[PDB]
Design a protein around this ligand. Structure first.
Ligand SMILES: CCCCCCCCCCCCCCCCCC(=O)OC[C@H](COP(=O)([O-])OCC(O)COP(=O)([O-])OC[C@@H](COC(=O)CCCCCCCCCCCCCCCCC)OC(=O)CCCCCCCCCCCCCCCCC)OC(=O)CCCCCCCCCCCCCCCCC
Ligand SMILES: CCCCCCCCCCCCCCCCCC(=O)OC[C@H](COP(=O)([O-])OCC[N+](C)(C)C)OC(=O)CCCCCCCCCCCCCCCCC
Ligand SMILES: NC(=O)C1=CN([C@@H]2O[C@H](COP(=O)(O)OP(=O)(O)OC[C@H]3O[C@@H](n4cnc5c(N)ncnc54)[C@H](OP(=O)(O)O)[C@@H]3O)[C@@H](O)[C@H]2O)C=CC1
Ligand SMILES: CCCCCCCCCCCC(=O)SCCNC(=O)CCNC(=O)[C@H](O)C(C)(C)COP(=O)(O)O
Ligand SMILES: Nc1ncnc2c1ncn2[C@@H]1O[C@H](COP(=O)(O)OP(=O)(O)O)[C@@H](O)[C@H]1O
Ligand code: SF4
Ligand code: SF4
Ligand code: SF4
Lengths: 161, 172, 51, 98, 56, 53, 118, 441, 198, 338, 49
């Protein structure tokens, strides 16, 4: 059966895509600085193999770090759609999560999840650099496990069908 | 003329010519110009409702001349025909035709020109800007409409239709 | 010779149109002297309270 | 003309061109320019010209008619367009095969 | 206006180019040395110790 | 007029061309209403440019 | 002084320190705290619903500053990443659980903070 | 060198093909998702040969109705909006807001003034902002490691922020006519002194690779040059203004000083060339001088001398007294001068005094009442003159609160100073203007 | 107020047909003076300021507007005196204020202009002060002031294809519409607004 | 029981519609649209799924149907456990089923399982739960026991079992639905782009087709929920007009500007190859079998007019989805601006 | 140990001895982040509940 080959290759693919996890160079608000702080030496991102890429075509993670305004929501949707699959989305900050300090505003979208599917949320205002690091590492672990979460059932011979 | 609408703001027809070897011309009325709009001076003050009405008619004329290009670039031609969009914007203007303040009319014309320029330059999204072109009481041409409400409430007053429809969630 | 074509009418333009009162469109490129840039000596003017 | 205006006239001075061509601000309009009776674009007066040419003159009859209308209707009710669903008059989108 | 005073970048250490900044460095090091001397002479450091009985 | 060739000055102002030459509406508009356009007026020149294009 | 994850404390006897005075709700700049209170059968002034919208709240600390009985405390926890937006709608259950889990460190910090004025 | 004016400029003549745009210009959307753009700038750029010609900036991508929300909320609950306005001068934004509130109240924050916090932490925040600005400018120009070197010091300063207020960013520390004296600690001052001593090393590391580099000099010198008149016409202020030699500093102004600055002997720097190189040098010198200001401020609260024995002529150090551990005592001047106020503050709280409890309850339910009136209070933030114009109607909420941000005025001149420049020069100009769009919008 | 201060009476000496209404308060800086200026003279006054000798070194620091129609004294109503500036807020539709700084005189000068016409017409000064362009654009969009003879009337800090004046007291902070994503249209759309009330 | 459903359709996503719906098999092409139809009026939507890969956009975008606190995703669903179905539909008064055999599956056993076992278990769970007011099962047009297609053969039995278990079940029989993420227009575009010279047909292309827009299908679902009398009846949904496969190719070619080219492979050899080789989305036996079969609306059951939905014509509906893929021939200079 | 690692204080938990941390009767054992797990925070009235 293909599973004999698929499962080890699945593990290798998950390991490779976890090791190389390039987010998009996109910051909107104060949460950008926290992202830069994680990128810089005190909490090196590179240790976990995450390197930022400017073009969405070369990005695996969409770091929605900052407030999203109605004047920008179409742009965020276009960026998400133009990012090559497979991809994940991480909301950072109260403003990106649920509107934050500007939830009662006439210009701010009440949450980036309304425009985009958000894979993970990192609470904070601003989230600490270690908080962002924790969120990214948790996202990486979940990403590695997503390939095979025990969906297929095992038959009498222990081979998934 | 040093303006976005100037006759010299046309897009050249060729790398080495403007549309001909014996003449110079270009299209800037039905499409966007060559150089971007760096400044849009305020409409000169109108002292009369006559001048205000003339400004409204000229703005509507420009909008009608530009609508086919807007539809083609935004891929919203299927939703409504060019004439349908013109008539819908005409209804939009008709709702505001009661104005009798030249200053307010000038401000409105400035805003209209700005939004028209945004539509030309793709600053706005098609779904966000089609709210002005959408029919007031007619279905969109790219969708199948539901006449269940009309069948159920045929020859019934709008009050009764609204009464049956409701105006508040019933769960709470 | 190719450049001269754009120079032909500049004289009449500047003669008949005010360069400051009239809003005339033009394009230009800013030049820097690389030798002066490399030989420049950094310095600032320090300001303190009166003594 | 350039030297009269004050443009750079030497190679070493070419590096301060922007200070003499673009940086200098333009004199603001005289306040008398805001009091003109009319601001319509200038066009040649086609009096004494043929009727065919006069056809291209600005339509003063439209201005007279508009003035009459606005004198007759200083105040009007705000038009309301019914939003009630109506079957489309142009049924081609839902009744076309090809 | 008539007797300008300029700061000139002429060495690797920009502090050295200014007499004031050299004195700032020296004062900082002097303060650190004084603190270290006082603490060493004292020989220990009192500290706040959490006590669970504080929450009776 | 000094430095303007055949251009000569009238009572209420100085002309923009030689005596017998024809006045230019576009030049008049540029001078009087420089940088300001209430609307894109379609003159004969603009219409002919559109037709040529 | 670090402000991390909100939590609700209790007295050493186990009684809730939160009395529904709504000072924290009013001081919350982002309107992230919702409080509804009804008398308890024994007669105590205790809340029946105490919700903090972690997505709408700016971790300013105004809630713990305005709390007159140190009921709501922004404890040091910051690794509170959530995969679902609903998981960030902290309820009274979640806040009390956070307080029960993090009481030791929170109490240790509060000791020093209270002793500083002395 | 011969003339090149005709090769350098191309005017447009009426209805002339040669004197016209004979090319289809490149209309690019610089940003918002652009590494050079800060993230919320949609600049429509008209490039012709990769040389900027026409600018149409759109800056509404970060508009959030901050002023509307401040009007809706009472005074205290609107302060964190000022932290959000600028991501690197939040302390200065808070200081301006509190200064306006206390000007309306008719009082001054004597506690903060005597504790020196509002000057030392303002200067630390100035170091933060200048570090970030210079690092981003170097990153845009091409230099890479400067961002890491500057952000290490930024992390240290953020640690100081968190230690004083518990938030490494968006401190929300300054408040009108109140100070958290408990947070202020002597060991914090000693750590700040150590940071100041080590900051010279980072300054020199950046200075060695940037200041004298031929490429850096050729990139910045004679780019963005402007006169005082431009500085005056476009309301340029702070570093942008001082680069013209205007010699305009609000901290050293007789009628406009707002903290201990007017009674400290520090120096402000200006350049005779209004270019990016002079602005970069000014930022470096201001970072260096913030160390001197912080040192003076900390010395103002230090007990250097000590009792000397008559017999031995040597210091008599207290073995079991806190003052032996440290030479800096933050509460020294406050206790010495305002003894009654200090005693009341440290003895009466809301757990034992009815009046304190009532004040606390009112303060946290409806903010302090502010008498009706109009005020305009400004500070010399790292990016220029940052001001608040507040109109109060006598209630617990501000009727109007307008924010004068230097970033907006600095971004207004970007077309003027960067018209004839290349794209590589424009990306340097955006960094030299030192703009963050939080306060622009 | 232990500084040397002089009133900016030059404006009213030159514009001999205007009456002077000036204020100074300790709520402001020692060198800050407020004055009332009529709208029909605002443009000429700015022309004089921009090129007078001692006012030549003047920069327009700030500009904004206040919706004085809904202004009410919430506390100490009886303490109001006829000399207070608040008396001009009542019953006036709008109040646009400009603030300049002069370097020669080391002074700050604020000018208040009352707009009583319903359309809020006032002459722009962005042709005199360059930085006033975006300031007036923001003021016009947020409060609906119809600036005349303005270099650029296009919106700045407002969303595309939307007309509104949020800073007016009538407007609600929650707005009137919210932007979501429509699957049927496969793009961001804007629809009516439903929000949360604390 | 009672089939009445009181819900308010005048509100946006943040309103309370009054519908609590569980939508099985929402990871397909039509699943997100059907879910969004209910979600956009404020209804609560549950999406039970066991989909690989979990991180697929198909699973991810289901969260956008309703919003936060209204849309829920139930992962690792077990399709042979009754307790799982009970939990899924415990609080739902509407149960929509779109779990059908995929076009990629040729195994008769798997097709029958998907189209019968899951549907019957869902119907039984609905019968057990007395709060399930409405059940809407999605069958296929042309379902028949004699149908060569295993999908249709099993779908007929599936709808019979659903009716037997839950007599108040509403069965839809849509024709070939088209849309942005469909299997018809997108497949046409992708096949023509991958070959660049032809579309591979395996028949005379005389089979009749009656395409319907997915928006129209969603509107039909909403109208069926509104209409109480629609319960317990079978509906066939299709476009206003019927076209053959050749006519559909001609219409698409004319709309997009791409010249048509149909390359014929013998039906027998194509069937043998597809039934003896691995099958995926773009190479499957179901497509070959359904090429010959007619999938149109018959008069044996209720039609869309009964639901009171006016479907849009195929030429008008499909034009917007081919704007990007347009032949670039001789065009005006003004059109060059784009 | 979270505070000890973060350097908030120099005291650390000590099992079976004089501790610097209070041990109340209602305390619960520490739990790691339970998001993306069936034992995750479910708001009352949420569809999952
Ligand atoms: C070296 C040792 C020394 C001795 C020599 C040994 C031999 C040396 C050989 C040297 C040359 C090798 C060339 C191949 C290199 C590797 C790649 C490869 O194998 O092809 C896969 C590769 C996959 O396509 P892709 O472009 O990578 O996919 C991009 C995306 O995935 C697509 O993205 P999308 O979104 O557009 O998706 C659209 C959809 C596809 O688009 C659609 O939706 C429409 C199409 C759906 C149905 C597709 C059915 C299969 C069509 C096959 C077409 C073959 C091309 C020629 C057709 C001619 C028609 C007249 O996606 C797909 O399904 C992708 C295509 C899947 C193909 C599956 C089968 C591939 C393997 C078998 C191919 C056998 C072809 C035999 C041809 C005749 C040979 C004489 O390309 C092909 O499929 C074409 C391969 C054609 C050459 C086959 C050579 C091996 C067999 C030769 C005959 C036997 C040996 C004879 C010599 C013996 C000597 C002793
Ligand atoms: C470096 C590693 C290279 C690995 C390359 C693997 C090539 C394909 C190997 C196929 C082995 C088949 C074993 C016997 C199968 C028995 C089941 C059966 O019914 O046979 C007919 C099978 C079954 O397909 P079916 O559709 O006819 O029936 C389905 C099965 N039943 C009916 C039981 C439900 O089909 C085949 O023709 C063979 C399997 C084709 C599988 C195609 C997908 C391969 C995926 C490879 C993933 C790894 C990629 C590595 C490279 C990654 C690079 C980053
Ligand atoms: N052209 C069309 O779209 C038409 C569709 N229909 C009917 O409408 C339904 C919805 O349309 P569409 O989105 O196109 O269909 P899809 O094939 O895209 O979706 C089928 C759904 O059922 C799931 N599924 C498939 N097999 C099984 C299985 N053995 N066990 C459990 N779940 C399974 C699939 O999940 P998974 O991803 O894990 O495989 C998927 O979610 C169709 O299933 C079909 O019955 C009728 C006529 C035309
Ligand atoms: C591309 C998308 C663009 C969308 C633009 C949206 C923004 C539009 C801005 C607002 C435009 C207006 O309402 S401008 C409002 C203009 N004001 C008036 O029209 C009042 C005076 N009216 C008249 O003179 C006549 O009624 C008249 C109807 C003109 C002719 O009618 P006929 O003689 O009978
Ligand atoms: N621990 C201390 N904390 C704050 N201020 C102190 C402290 N010790 C001395 N001061 C200041 O020192 C001055 C008295 O000097 P000195 O007699 O040398 O100190 P001490 O008697 O405490 O040893 C006072 O201003 C007093 O406020
Ligand atoms: S969540 Fe806080 S820190 Fe992040 S962008 Fe919003 S206001 Fe700034
Ligand atoms: S941290 Fe601030 S915003 Fe968040 S709940 Fe507490 S008081 Fe409200
Ligand atoms: S947490 Fe504190 S402030 Fe909030 S209601 Fe309870 S007792 Fe009052």
């Amino acid at each position: 059966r293909v599973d004999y080959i698929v499962t080890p290759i699945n593990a290798v693919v998950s390991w490779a895509r976890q090791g190389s996890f390039w987010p998009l160079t996109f910051g909107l608000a104060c949460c950008a600085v926290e992202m830069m702080h994680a990128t810089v030496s005190r909490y090196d991102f590179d240790r976990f193999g995450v390197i930022f890429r400017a073009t969405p075509r070369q990005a695996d993670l969409i770091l929605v770090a900052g407030t999203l305004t109605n004047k920008m929501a179409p742009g965020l949707r276009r960026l998400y759609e133009q990012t090559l699959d497979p991809k994940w989305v991480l909301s950072m900050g109260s403003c990106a999560n649920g509107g934050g300090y500007y939830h009662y505003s006439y210009s701010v979208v009440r949450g980036c999840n309304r425009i985009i599917p958000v894979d993970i949320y990192v609470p904070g205002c601003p989230p600490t650099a270690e908080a962002l690091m924790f969120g990214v590492l948790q996202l990486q672990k979940s990403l590695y496990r997503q390939i095979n979460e025990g969906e297929k059932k095992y038959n009498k011979k222990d081979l998934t069908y | 003329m040093n303006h976005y609408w100037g006759s010299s703001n046309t897009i050249p027809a060729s790398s080495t010519q403007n549309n001909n070897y014996f003449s110079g011309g270009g299209n800037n009325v039905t499409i966007r110009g060559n150089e971007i709009m760096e400044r849009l001076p305020s409409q000169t003050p109108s002292q009369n409702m006559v001048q205000a009405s003339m400004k409204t008619l000229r703005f509507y004329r420009k909008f009608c001349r530009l609508i086919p290009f807007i539809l083609r670039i935004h891929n919203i031609g299927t939703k409504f025909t060019a004439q349908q969009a013109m008539i819908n914007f005409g209804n939009y203007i008709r709702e505001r035709n009661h104005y009798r303040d030249p200053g307010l009319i000038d401000h409105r014309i400035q805003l209209g020109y700005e939004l028209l320029y945004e539509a030309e330059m793709h600053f706005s999204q098609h779904t966000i800007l089609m709210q002005y072109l959408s029919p007031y009481n007619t279905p969109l041409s790219d969708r199948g409409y539901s006449y269940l409400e009309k069948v159920k409430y045929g020859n019934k007053s709008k009050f009764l239709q609204g009464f049956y429809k409701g105006n508040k969630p019933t769960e709470f | 010779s190719n450049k001269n074509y754009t120079i032909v009418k500049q004289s009449n333009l500047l003669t008949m149109f005010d360069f400051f009162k009239d809003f005339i469109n033009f394009s230009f490129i800013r030049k820097q002297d690389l030798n002066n840039q490399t030989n420049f000596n950094p310095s600032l003017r320090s300001i303190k309270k009166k003594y | 003309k350039m030297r009269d205006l004050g443009f750079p006239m030497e190679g070493e001075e070419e590096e301060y061109i922007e200070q003499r061509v673009f940086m200098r601000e333009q004199l603001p309009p005289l306040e008398s320019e805001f009091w003109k009776k009319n601001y319509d674009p200038y066009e040649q007066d086609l009096f004494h010209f043929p009727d065919s040419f006069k056809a291209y003159q600005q339509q003063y009859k439209r201005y007279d008619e508009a003035k009459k209308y606005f004198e007759e209707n200083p105040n009007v009710e705000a038009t309301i367009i019914d939003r009630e669903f109506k079957e489309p008059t142009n049924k081609k989108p839902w009744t076309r095969k090809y | 206006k008539y007797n300008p005073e300029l700061y000139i970048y002429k060495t690797y250490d920009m502090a050295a180019d200014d007499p004031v900044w050299r004195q700032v460095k020296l004062d900082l090091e002097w303060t650190f040395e004084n603190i270290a001397e006082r603490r060493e002479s004292l020989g220990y450091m009192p500290t706040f110790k959490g006590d669970p009985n504080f929450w009776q | 007029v000094k430095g303007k060739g055949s251009i000569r000055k009238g009572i209420h102002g100085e002309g923009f061309g030689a005596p017998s030459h024809a006045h230019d509406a576009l030049i008049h508009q540029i001078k009087q209403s420089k940088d300001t356009m209430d609307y894109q007026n379609i003159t004969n020149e603009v219409a002919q440019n559109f037709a040529n294009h | 002084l670090f402000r991390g994850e909100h939590a609700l404390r209790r007295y050493p006897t186990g009684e809730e320190r939160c009395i529904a005075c709504k000072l924290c709700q009013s001081a919350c700049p982002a309107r992230a705290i919702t409080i509804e209170t009804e008398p308890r059968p024994d007669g105590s002034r205790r809340t029946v619903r105490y919700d903090i919208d972690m997505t709408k709240c700016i971790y300013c600390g105004f809630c713990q500053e305005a709390c007159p009985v140190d009921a709501i405390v922004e404890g040091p926890n910051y690794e509170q990443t959530a995969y679902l937006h609903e998981d960030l709608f902290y309820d009274k259950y979640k806040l009390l659980e956070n307080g029960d889990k993090w009481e030791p460190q929170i109490a240790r910090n509060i000791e020093y903070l209270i002793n500083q004025p002395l | 060198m011969n003339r090149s004016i005709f090769q350098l400029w191309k005017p447009e003549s009426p209805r002339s093909n040669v004197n016209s745009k004979q090319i289809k210009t490149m209309n690019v959307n610089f940003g918002p998702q652009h590494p050079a753009a800060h993230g919320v700038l949609r600049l429509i750029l008209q490039l012709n040969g990769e040389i900027a010609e026409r600018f149409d900036p759109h800056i509404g991508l970060l508009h959030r109705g901050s002023e509307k929300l401040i009007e809706d909320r009472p005074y205290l609950q609107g302060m964190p909006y000022f932290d959000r306005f600028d991501y690197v001068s939040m302390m200065v934004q808070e200081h301006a807001y509190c200064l306006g509130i206390e000007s309306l109240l008719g009082t001054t924050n004597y506690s903060a003034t005597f504790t020196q916090i509002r000057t030392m932490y303002d200067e630390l925040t100035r170091i933060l902002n200048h570090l970030l600005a210079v690092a981003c400018h170097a990153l845009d120009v091409g230099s890479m490691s400067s961002v890491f070197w500057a952000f290490e010091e930024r992390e240290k300063l953020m640690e100081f922020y968190e230690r004083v207020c518990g938030a490494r960013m968006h401190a929300a520390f300054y408040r009108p006519n109140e100070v958290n004296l408990n947070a202020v600690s002597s060991f914090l001052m000693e750590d700040i002194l150590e940071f100041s001593r080590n900051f010279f090393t980072t300054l020199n590391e950046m200075h060695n690779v940037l200041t004298y580099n031929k490429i850096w000099k050729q990139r910045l010198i004679n780019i963005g040059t402007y006169s005082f008149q431009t500085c005056l016409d476009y309301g340029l202020t702070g570093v942008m203004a001082r680069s013209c030699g205007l010699k305009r500093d609000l901290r050293l102004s007789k009628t406009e000083t707002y903290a201990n600055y007017y009674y400290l002997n520090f120096r402000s720097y200006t350049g005779q060339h209004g270019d990016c190189y002079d602005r970069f040098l000014i930022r470096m010198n201001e970072m260096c001088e913030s160390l001197n200001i912080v040192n003076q401020s900390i010395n103002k609260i230090s007990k250097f001398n000590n009792i000397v024995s008559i017999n031995t002529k040597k210091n008599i150090l207290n073995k079991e007294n806190f003052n032996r551990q440290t030479t800096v005592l933050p509460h020294l001047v406050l206790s010495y001068l305002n003894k009654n106020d200090y005693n009341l503050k440290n003895t009466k709280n809301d757990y034992n005094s009815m009046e304190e409890l009532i004040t606390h309850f009112k303060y946290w339910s409806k903010g302090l009442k502010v008498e009706s009136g109009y005020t305009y209070q400004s500070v010399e933030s790292p990016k220029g003159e940052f001001g608040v114009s507040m109109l109060s109607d006598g209630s617990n909420k501000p009727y109007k609160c307008k924010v004068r941000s230097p970033a907006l005025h600095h971004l207004q001149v970007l077309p003027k100073i960067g018209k004839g420049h290349f794209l590589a020069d424009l990306v340097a100009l955006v960094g030299t203007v030192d703009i963050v769009f939080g306060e622009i919008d | 107020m232990q500084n040397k201060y002089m009133q900016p009476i030059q404006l009213f000496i030159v514009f001999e047909k205007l009456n002077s209404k000036m204020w100074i308060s300790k709520k402001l800086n020692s060198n800050h003076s407020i004055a009332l200026i009529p709208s029909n003279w605002f443009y000429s006054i700015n022309l004089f300021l921009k090129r007078e000798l001692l006012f030549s070194n003047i920069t327009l620091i700030e500009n904004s507007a206040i919706d004085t129609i809904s202004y009410n004294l919430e506390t100490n109503q009886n303490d109001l005196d006829k000399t207070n500036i608040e008396n001009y807020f009542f019953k006036n539709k709008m109040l646009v204020f400009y603030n300049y700084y002069n370097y020669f005189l080391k002074s700050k000068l604020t000018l208040f202009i009352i707009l009583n016409n319903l359309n809020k017409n006032i002459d722009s000064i962005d042709r005199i002060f360059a930085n006033a362009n975006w300031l007036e654009r923001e003021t016009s969009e947020m409060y609906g002031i119809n600036y005349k003879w303005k270099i650029d009337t296009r919106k700045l800090l407002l969303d595309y294809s939307k007309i509104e004046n949020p800073m007016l007291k009538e407007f609600q902070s929650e707005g009137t519409q919210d932007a979501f994503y429509n699957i049927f249209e496969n793009q961001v759309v804007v629809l009516k607004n439903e929000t949360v009330e604390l | 029981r009672s089939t009445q459903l009181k819900f308010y359709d005048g509100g946006n996503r943040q309103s309370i519609s009054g519908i609590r719906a569980t939508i099985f098999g929402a990871t397909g092409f039509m699943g997100p649209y059907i879910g969004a139809a209910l979600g956009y009026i404020g209804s609560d939507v549950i999406f039970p799924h066991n989909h690989v890969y979990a991180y697929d956009d198909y699973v991810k975008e289901l969260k956008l149907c309703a919003g936060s606190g209204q849309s829920y995703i139930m992962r690792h669903f077990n399709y042979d456990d009754d307790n799982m179905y009970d939990m899924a539909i415990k609080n739902s008064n509407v149960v929509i089923n779109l779990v059908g055999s995929r076009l990629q599956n040729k195994n008769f056993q798997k097709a029958a399982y998907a189209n019968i076992h899951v549907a019957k278990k869902i119907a039984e769970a609905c019968a057990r739960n007395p709060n399930v007011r409405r059940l809407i099962h999605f069958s296929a047009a042309g379902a028949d026991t004699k149908s060569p297609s295993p999908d249709l053969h099993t779908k007929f039995h599936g709808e019979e079992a659903v009716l037997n278990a839950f007599p108040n079940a509403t069965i839809f029989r849509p024709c070939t639905v088209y849309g942005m993420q469909d299997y018809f227009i997108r497949h046409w575009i992708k096949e023509r782009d991958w070959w660049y010279h032809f579309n591979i047909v395996t028949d005379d292309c005389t089979a009749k087709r009656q395409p319907i827009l997915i928006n129209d299908v969603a509107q039909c679902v909403l109208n069926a929920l509104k209409l109480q009398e629609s319960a317990g009846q079978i509906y066939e949904l299709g476009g206003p007009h019927v076209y053959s496969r050749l006519e559909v190719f001609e219409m698409l070619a004319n709309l997009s500007g791409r010249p048509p080219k149909l390359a014929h492979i013998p039906h027998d050899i194509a069937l043998k190859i597809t039934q003896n080789f691995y099958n995926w989305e773009f190479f499957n036996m179901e497509k070959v079998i359904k090429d010959k079969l007619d999938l149109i609306v018959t008069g044996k059951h209720k039609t869309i007019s009964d639901l009171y939905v006016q479907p849009v014509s195929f030429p008008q509906g499909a034009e917007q989805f081919i704007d990007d893929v347009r032949y670039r021939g001789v065009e005006t200079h003004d059109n060059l601006e784009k | 140990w979270h505070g000890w690692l973060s350097h908030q204080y120099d005291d650390f938990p000590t099992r079976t001895g004089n501790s610097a941390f209070v041990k109340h009767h209602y305390l619960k054992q520490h739990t790691a982040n339970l998001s993306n797990t069936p034992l995750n925070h479910v708001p009352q009235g949420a569809p999952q509940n």
